[PDB]
Amino acid sequence: SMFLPPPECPVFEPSWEEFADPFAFIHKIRPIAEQTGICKVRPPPDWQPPFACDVDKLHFTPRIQRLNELEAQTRVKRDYTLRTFGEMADAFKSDYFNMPVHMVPTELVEKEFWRLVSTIEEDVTVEYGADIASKEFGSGFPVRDGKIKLSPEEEEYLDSGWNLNNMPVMEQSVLAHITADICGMKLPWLYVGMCFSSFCWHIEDHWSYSINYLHWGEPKTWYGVPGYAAEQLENVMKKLAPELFVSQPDLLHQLVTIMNPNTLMTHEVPVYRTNQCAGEFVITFPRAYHSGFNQGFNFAEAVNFCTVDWLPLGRQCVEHYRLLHRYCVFSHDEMICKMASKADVLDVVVASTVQKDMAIMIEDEKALRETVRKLGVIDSERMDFELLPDDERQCVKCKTTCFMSAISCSCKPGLLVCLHHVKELCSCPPYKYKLRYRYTLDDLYPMMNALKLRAES
Numbered sequence: 001s002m003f004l005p006p007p008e009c010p011v012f013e014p015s016w017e018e019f020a021d022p023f024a025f026i027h028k029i030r031p032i033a034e035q036t037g038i039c040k041v042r043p044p045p046d047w048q049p050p051f052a053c054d055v056d057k058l059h060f061t062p063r064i065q066r067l068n069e070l071e072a073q074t075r076v077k078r079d080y081t082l083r084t085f086g087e088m089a090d091a092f093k094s095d096y097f098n099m100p101v102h103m104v105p106t107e108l109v110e111k112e113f114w115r116l117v118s119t120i121e122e123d124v125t126v127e128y129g130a131d132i133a134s135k136e137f138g139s140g141f142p143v144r145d146g147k148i149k150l151s152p153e154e155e156e157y158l159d160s161g162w163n164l165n166n167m168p169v170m171e172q173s174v175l176a177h178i179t180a181d182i183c184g185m186k187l188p189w190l191y192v193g194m195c196f197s198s199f200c201w202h203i204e205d206h207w208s209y210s211i212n213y214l215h216w217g218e219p220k221t222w223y224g225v226p227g228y229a230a231e232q233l234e235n236v237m238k239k240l241a242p243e244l245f246v247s248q249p250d251l252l253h254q255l256v257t258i259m260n261p262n263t264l265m266t267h268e269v270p271v272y273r274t275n276q277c278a279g280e281f282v283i284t285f286p287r288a289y290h291s292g293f294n295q296g297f298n299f300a301e302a303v304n305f306c307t308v309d310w311l312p313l314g315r316q317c318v319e320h321y322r323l324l325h326r327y328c329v330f331s332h333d334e335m336i337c338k339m340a341s342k343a344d345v346l347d348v349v350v351a352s353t354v355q356k357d358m359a360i361m362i363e364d365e366k367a368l369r370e371t372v373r374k375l376g377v378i379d380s381e382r383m384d385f386e387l388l389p390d391d392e393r394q395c396v397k398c399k400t401t402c403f404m405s406a407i408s409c410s411c412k413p414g415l416l417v418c419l420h421h422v423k424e425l426c427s428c429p430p431y432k433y434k435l436r437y438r439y440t441l442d443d444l445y446p447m448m449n450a451l452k453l454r455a456e457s
């Protein structure tokens with residue numbers, strides 16, 4: 001009546017045989033999980049990564065959070081040790097409820113969360129940790145490094161397919177051979193939670209998957225929306241919180257918010273829930289919106305994840321970013337061309353899928369180049385876009401990261417537009433412009449052919 005819990009998302013309990021290969025497993029469950037946006041995976045009783053840390057030596061700078069529904073927040077930004085954070089967090093929860101922390105029912109914390117965020121009178125603030133691994137606070141999974149002898153148990157999980165440090169560099173990940181600067185998306189993030197600390201509604205950068213593991217502690221409660229309903233959710237957000245939709249200055253500056261899932265469900269957005277317990281994975285699918293909050297003191301690790309299934313969606317995402325004038329994290333076309341340049345060592349299923357995306361890329365590029373030639377741009381020169389800092393190769397109009405080609409004018413030194421925005425660079429006549437291109441079409445067809453040969457093996 002006050003809060004009606006969404007239906008439970010799918011929960012999978014794979015055998016060791018089914019579990020061992022994450023890419024195969026996710027591909028298998030996709031017909032089901034893509035309809036719910038999120039799903040939970042319980043590893044075989046077998047699989048038990050060791051979790052060891054000195055809570056007095058781990059330390060981090062906490063972020064602070066007000067809990068008001070529809071209030072604007074941002075995803076990116078005092079010091080706690082893991083022990084002193086834990087002490088603060090446990091005391092907060094047990095004081096809030098006047099109960100021992102584990103005797104508080106998960107259903108109650110959930111009901112209470114949605115009450116407190118909806119109430120103007122309440123001004124509850126909480127703290128949390130969120131960062132990539134560092135020397136001050138490393139991964140929860142085993143990683144290789146000298147000077148430290150690992151135990152046989154730790155050694156066992158160094159090369160696990162579900163060790164999140166590994167997933168982005170495995171052979172069926174399309175980011176594996178990517179050498180570009182995208183620290184954000186190949187490195188796991190670490191999240192230290194406390195009761196009610198919350199992650200607002202969002203999808204992943206470039207519509208990637210995310211894989212999320214709860215190492216230890218009280219559960220993390222999730223809400224998820226399938227990819228096919230992303231635009232309906234956004235329309236609801238626009239109607240109820242239009243303040244979130246003003247133009248952001250940077251990539252690091254887009255706005256997100258807390259919103260009751262019942263509100264979404266009332267507006268015909270399908271929503272699913274789950275409580276993720278210690279030792280369980282949650283997987284979010286491409287363009288699947290999700291949000292949630294922590295039941296209490298806990299420690300989670302998450303990583304973006306890009307598969308062959310994701311490739312066409314990645315291209316659509318960048319297109320969508322362009323229409324919104326939103327910054328990219330990386331160049332999709334650069335990733336594709338990098339993989340083509342390494343066709344001889346690519347996984348063959350990867351090669352096959354990349355070949356298909358590349359064919360779409362080349363036909364789109366060919367049409368765009370014909371169009372800008374008809375606008376009177378005649379001069380051209382090869383340009384190694386990958387050498388430019390990312391903030392030095394965005395289209396001045398739509399902020400897309402250029403790689404295949406761009407237009408420049410010596411009138412505006414250093415400025416670029418993508419080929420969709422030739423008319424947005426300056427007032428000079430087009431014959432003063434140069435087409436800057438990474439590859440000729442003659443360079444591109446043999447690259448695509450290499451992929452095709454590799455895929456035929």
Ligand SMILES: O=C(CSc1nc(-c2ccccc2)cc(=O)[nH]1)NO
Binds near residue numbers: 008
């Ligand atoms: O949680 C599960 C996983 S297998 C499975 N789940 C579902 C499902 C579970 C929750 C929400 C929607 C679908 C549909 C189906 O055909 N199969 N079953 O109870």
Ligand SMILES: O=C(CSc1nc(-c2ccccc2)cc(=O)[nH]1)NO
Binds near residue numbers: 128
């Ligand atoms: O969305 C996720 C991470 S869940 C999570 N995220 C956060 C978080 C993420 C970004 C910025 C701040 C917090 C905190 C937390 O306790 N949990 N994976 O797809």
Ligand SMILES: [Cl-]
Binds near residue numbers: 067069116121
């Ligand atoms: Cl509040």
Ligand SMILES: [Mn+2]
Binds near residue numbers: 204290
């Ligand atoms: Mn996420």
Ligand SMILES: [Zn+2]
Binds near residue numbers: 395397398400417418
């Ligand atoms: Zn543009």
Ligand SMILES: [Zn+2]
Binds near residue numbers: 409410
């Ligand atoms: Zn000019």
